[PDB]
Every structure is written in structure tokens, then in C-alpha cells.
Amino acid sequence: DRVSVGNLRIARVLYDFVNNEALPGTDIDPDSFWAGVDKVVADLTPQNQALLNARDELQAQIDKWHRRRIDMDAYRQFLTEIGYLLPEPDDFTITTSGVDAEITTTAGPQLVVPVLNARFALNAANARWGSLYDALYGTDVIPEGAEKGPTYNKVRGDKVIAYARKFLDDSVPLSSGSFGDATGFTVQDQLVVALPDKSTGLANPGQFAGYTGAAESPTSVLLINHGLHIEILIDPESQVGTTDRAGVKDVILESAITTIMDFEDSVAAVDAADKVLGYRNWLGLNKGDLAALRVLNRDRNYTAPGGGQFTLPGRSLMFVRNVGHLMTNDAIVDTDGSEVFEGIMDALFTGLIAIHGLKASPLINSRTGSIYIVKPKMHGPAEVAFTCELFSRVEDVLGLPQNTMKIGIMDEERRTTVNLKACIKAAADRVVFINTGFLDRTGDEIHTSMEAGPMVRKGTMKSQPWILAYEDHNVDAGLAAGFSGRAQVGKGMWTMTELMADMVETKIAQPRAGASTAWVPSPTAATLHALHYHQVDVAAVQQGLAGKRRATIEQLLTIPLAKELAWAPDEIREEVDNNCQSILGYVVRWVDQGVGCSKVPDIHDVALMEDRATLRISSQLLANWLRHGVITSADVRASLERMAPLVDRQNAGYRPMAPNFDDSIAFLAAQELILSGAQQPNGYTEPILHRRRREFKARAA
């Protein structure tokens, strides 16, 4: 079933894929590459294993501590004693180089898409440019007599048009009058726009940055604001442009400035066939020839306010997100049976692939010659140090100069949060971002303090002292480490796919909090969230936050215990009902269809775009309420059974779970996640999930 190379037994599909598709073009000797792999896996595996065991020893110690008991003073002293809370390093500045300006300079939206889905991955890459009009018309941003019918509704149209003209006014203002009264654009020398009883220019001429067509009647005017590009498309002959008083047919926003192709929480990849699919798609993006023709967009040409032709990138600068340290995968199995660590595997294979995106021989990702890898679920700075070591070993096997493989550190584990400055310092010449999330981090929060008592409800976690301090701490640390002109400070994902008006209203808080990037669920959402980077001068904000220490180690460690009495019976029911629905709705699709991400209607029927992290939080909360006797096993079974046919309801378009639950592999998976969730390492969900997806796939054979 396998190819023996050194002490490794590689799955043939994987072996064949690396040799036939990946290796050619990289100037890496196939046999050499394979011994390289063999070497790295043997060398780094016990360290990898050492790190994983340290996690369990720490959690055990913490579990016992709580069981013998809150004295927040000795608690913090205990953590220090065991090596969980480490000493905070001296002040420093990251020194990472050869990084693209999308990362170092531009604040903008950031897309995340499951790599296994070439259609989504294609749109993601093409989402760097996005029509504002389409985004406004199609979503609930413009309210509905402007209803969306089977045909275009001109009423909705000039509402769209009005909104856009106002956007231009706030973003690239004219010295006199508004864009709403524009009648035409000309390029005298510079960008002059004709008003009815006037003619005016850009209040700051530097905002003009190019155009197309002829200077007298340009086909489009390129504008720039806060490093982001705005393009007004001008075609009086077009249907839209015929009714526009300056012949404007559309406004195009530079939107998803970067994208993350995800091998982690948004996919289901449980054996060697899945991984190859992922790697193959990642290959196609890097060579630049993936298609379905819908091709990757080529770059864009323009004319400076009196000069030559310059080209702007037309694709989203791509990061890849490898899996984390925990999992093994039988794509590579050792001589004596043991599955190799998935993360080590990802570093070599996605790193090898990325080499193709460094040159044309057609499409290039990084222009400065870096490979950008996001690493998730690290706990503490020894774990960061190992990842950097993994990368340096890989860059040797690949022939790449050291420091080629950049790191984006996800801050989503408690032991990383309280040692963030040191985690950053361990990657000080590789790091190109940090980022915060609600979902994994809360999962970890619940699991680390599982034994201390029952946690507050899920909806309530969003406002807890620990999480507010954690968000602020992330930014402070990034800024103090000198991120402003160097790396991204990122914030989490907007998960309500349909609530775009709501998104435009609230998600502005993230750049206001000094985040240079944040996550959006789609190309449409990317365009809309780009509006926020125009309103908010992030570099200004980041400059204002300098030297500020707005979160103390005492605040970070405030465990979210519910106060006594707390809830009335029906509130508890709603909570478990809601959690069981989230688990089922997601798990049914993960196990039966290997679809890691899609729109799962929640209890109140909102379309949520959640990944595996939602599993982690929902399950850990229930296991917590189980452990402290808030609810019983008799309670949990009940809801899980009640919600099961309703998930079945929300899935018309599949194999029902009700009424014969005990023979549904998904229903068993979801149930296991609850009842044994307290036993899962850091409440991770992969172990139970990977097992069951494999189980189900052995029903399909």
C-alpha cells in the first residue's frame, strides 16, 4: 500500500503526487527530498511528542489544584511554579525581512477559505478587486420599495449609486461640492471632475494615482486612500452608466488584500487522499493555472497623472494555514505502524509547493520571495520555537535561504496569551502576524479551567473580563514588538453570512481597535469590510496606542465562572439546546460529507459560517456543565435527540439522523464530543472527528 523510504512508509498517491506534480520545477532531487523528509520526521518527532506531553502534564497539575480548592493570588504563583506562566522578556523589535507590502503596510480585510474547495479558493484569490455596487445590491446593506426581484430594480440601483457616491465623498473628498453632482471626469495634468455650475479637484491631489482610457474622456479613474485603491468605472454607453449623471457604471474596491488557504479548521482531511486534493489545489494556485473557463485574474494596468504604464496586483496575496502540532495522519506511516505528525508533514509539503509561487515559468504569489505560513493552536513559546525550528529544517531540505518561511502566530491558546511577548520573541525574525479569535481561545479557556466550576453561557463569554483583556493584550504586544510598519495585527472572523448591514455597522470596531486586518467570510463581505479601512486610519490609531498597557496578567486569568444561583431551568435548556444544535448541524456535514465549512442555521435560524472551533466551544461548555452537575446525562441525551430531526429539517438538499440515532455515525460523533469532551486533550475535537469520518468512510466502501 506504501513506498518505503528510510524508516517511512509513504502512501502511494502522496508519493506519486509529490514526484509527478510537486517536485518538477523546484530543482530539488526527488530522492534527496525524500531522505530529507525521512530525516526531519525522525529528528523532530520526539520533541513534537515532548511538547504534546508537557501540555497534558500542565493540565493535570491545574486540574488537581482546582480539585483541592478562589485565591487569585496563589493561583498565579502556582502557574509560575509549574512553568505555565513564564518570565516576560525584555523589550524588543521584530526583525523579519523580505515581506510583501500587503503585509507590512496596507491595512485591509483578510479572507479565509477551505483549500479543498477550488471554486471558493479561486474566488478568494480573485477577491482582491470587488465591485461595490454588486456588494451593495445583493446584500441587506441597502434595505428593501427597493426589493430584489427576479429582475433588476432601478429603485434599488440609485440607492446603491447614492451610497457609493457618499462613500467617495468621505474617502477622497473634493475641495468643493460632492461626487453626487459630478458630471464628468477629465485629466488636465490633475484629476479634475466637472460639477454642474463648477469644476473642482481632489482636496489632496495625491489621492489621484492613475487611470485608463484617454485623459480627455478616461474609461476609469484610479484613486487611493489609506493605501487602498478605489476605481471608478466610466462607461456612459452601459445600462447603469446611461442613467448616471457622470456615466459611472461601477465603483471597484481593492478588498481582500490577503487570503488564507486553509488546511486546518475549515476542511475535513482525514487520510492521504484528502491531503493530496488539498495539496493539488494549493499547487494550482502557486503555479497560477487553477481554473474551473474561470481563470485566476491577471494583474492591472494604469496611467499615472502624466506618465507611463504601471501594474497593480490583481490577486489576493496568499498565505497558507498548516495544521497544528496535535494530529497524526496515516498518509505517512512509520516502519512499525505509527502515523507521522500531520504538522511536520504540512510544513514540508506546503512549503515545497509554495516554491512555484515564487516565479513565473505563469502566476506569482509573493513578490519579495517569502512563503507565508499561519500556524494554529500553539501553546506557549517553546511551541513557537519548535515551529521555527521545523521551518528552518524544511528550508534546508528545500534549498531555500533561511528565514524564507514566514510565520503567522495564531493567539488562540491561553498559554500563548499569557506568554505572548515571549511567543513573539521566539519567532522574531519570521513573524509576519498575530491574530485573535473568539472561538478556539474560549474553548481553551473552558478546558483549562474545566475543574474550577461551571462556566457562564456561550453568548455571555463575549463580554467577559478575560476576553476583553486578551483582545487588547494582543494588540499591545504586537505594537510593543514593533508591528506597525512590519507585520499584521489581526482580529477574528465575522460569522453571520447574511447579516451584512449588521457587519458594516459593528465590524468597524476592529480597525478602531488598531487591527491592521480582520477576517471576513466571503468575497462580498471582504468588499464591504473594506469600507471600514477607508473610514478608519489604522496606522494613526496604532500610533496612538503606543506604549499603552491596557491589560494586566491578573485580568487575563480571570476565569469565567458563573455566579451561584445563576440560571432558571429554561435558560439552561436553551443553552444546551443551542449547543447541541451547533454541534449536530456542523458534525453531520463534517462526518457524512467531509465538508468542513458551510452555512449552518443556528437555533434562531441565523446562517452561521463556523469552523471546527465552534465544535470546541460548544462541546467543552456542555462537558463543563456536565461535570459540575448543572445538567445531567439524561438532559444532554434529550436535547441531542430533540435537535437531531431539526438539523435534518434545515438540511433539505443528505441522510437523516432521526429517528434511528444509535446507527447514525454523526449522531454518535456529536454525542461522544459531549460525554467524553472533558477527556479530550485541551478539548480538541480532531481526535473524535477524524476517527468518525474514517469510520463513516468505511461504510462507503
Author numbering: 3 to 71, 76 to 150, 153 to 197, 199 to 301, 311 to 379, 384 to 675, 679 to 726
What did the authors write?
GlcB generates malate and coenzyme A (CoA) from glyoxylate and acetyl coenzyme A (AcCoA) following the conversion of isocitrate to succinate and glyoxylate by ICL. Because of the essentiality of the glyoxylate shunt in infection and the absence of it in humans, both ICL and GlcB are attractive targets for drug discovery. The active site is an ∼20 Å-long tunnel located at the interface of the TIM barrel and a loop comprising residues 616–633 of domain II. A Mg2+ ion required for activity is bound at the bottom of the active site tunnel in an octahedral coordination by one oxygen each from the carboxylate side chains of Glu-434 and Asp-462, two water molecules, and two oxygens of glyoxylate.
Finally, we obtained crystals of ligand-free GlcB to prove that the open lid protein conformation discovered through fragment is indeed corresponding to the apo form of the enzyme. The best quality malate synthase crystals are packed in the P43212 space group and always have density for bound glyoxylate, which tends to co-purify with the enzyme. We diluted the enzyme to 0.1 mg/ml in assay buffer containing 5 mm Mg2+ and incubated it with substrates to remove residual glyoxylate. After 1 h, we concentrated the enzyme back to 5 mg/ml, extensively washing it with an excess of the same buffer. This sample yielded a P43212 space group crystal that diffracted to 2.2 Å, showing well defined density for the CoA binding loop in the “in” conformation and an open active site lid. Interestingly, there is no electron density for Mg2+; the peak at the corresponding position is of the similar intensity to surrounding waters (2 σ in the 2Fo − Fc map). Collection of multiple crystals were required to achieve this uniform conformation of the moving loop structure with the data still of lesser quality than the glyoxylate-bound P43212 crystals used for fragment soaking. The apo structure has the “in” conformation for the CoA binding loop and the open active site lid conformation originally discovered through the fragment-bound structures, with a disordered Mg2+ ion. Combining our observations from all the crystal structures and published kinetic studies thus far, we propose that glyoxylate binds first to the apo enzyme (active site lid open and CoA binding loop “in”).
